[PDB]
Amino acid sequence: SMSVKKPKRDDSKDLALCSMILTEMETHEDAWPFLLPVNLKLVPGYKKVIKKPMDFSTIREKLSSGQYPNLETFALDVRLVFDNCETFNEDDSDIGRAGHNMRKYFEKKWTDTFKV
Numbered sequence: 821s822m823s824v825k826k827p828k829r830d831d832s833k834d835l836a837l838c839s840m841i842l843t844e845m846e847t848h849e850d851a852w853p854f855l856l857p858v859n860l861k862l863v864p865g866y867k868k869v870i871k872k873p874m875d876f877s878t879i880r881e882k883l884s885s886g887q888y889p890n891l892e893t894f895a896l897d898v899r900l901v902f903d904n905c906e907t908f909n910e911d912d913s914d915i916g917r918a919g920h921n922m923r924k925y926f927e928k929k930w931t932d933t934f935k936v
């Protein structure tokens with residue numbers, strides 16, 4: 821509270837670390853469904869069903885332009901990518917499996933990079 825400060829983690833490396841994690845996402849072989857925005861004019865249903873589309877290139881633009889206030893907002897967007905993928909795609913599909921794979925890959929790097 822007022823004049824009662826909680827000690828807080830050093831966040832000065834966060835931007836560089838998130839960029840590093842995102843680069844590893846982008847270069848993963850199963851990254852292909854998520855590299856660009858889904859084409860809302862070519863994929864029936866997508867615009868109406870998925871209220872907040874997100875993809876790596878959009879995350880990369882936001883990261884590069886100071887649009888994430890903190891590392892949690894960055895992680896919300898990354899997870900949004902895989903949550904959208906699960907909403908729209910069957911688990912037993914190439915894209916669907918790609919998403920499950922990429923989520924697992926992200927979550928480990930996230931724990932390995934930040935959680936002590």
Ligand SMILES: Cc1ncccc1N[C@@H]1CCC[C@@H]1S(C)(=O)=O
Pocket residue numbers: 852853854855856857858859863875905908909915
């Ligand atoms: C992630 C997703 N979910 C539902 C429909 C399509 C997609 N991705 C597409 C599949 C191949 C690449 C395109 S994209 C995103 O490059 O236009």
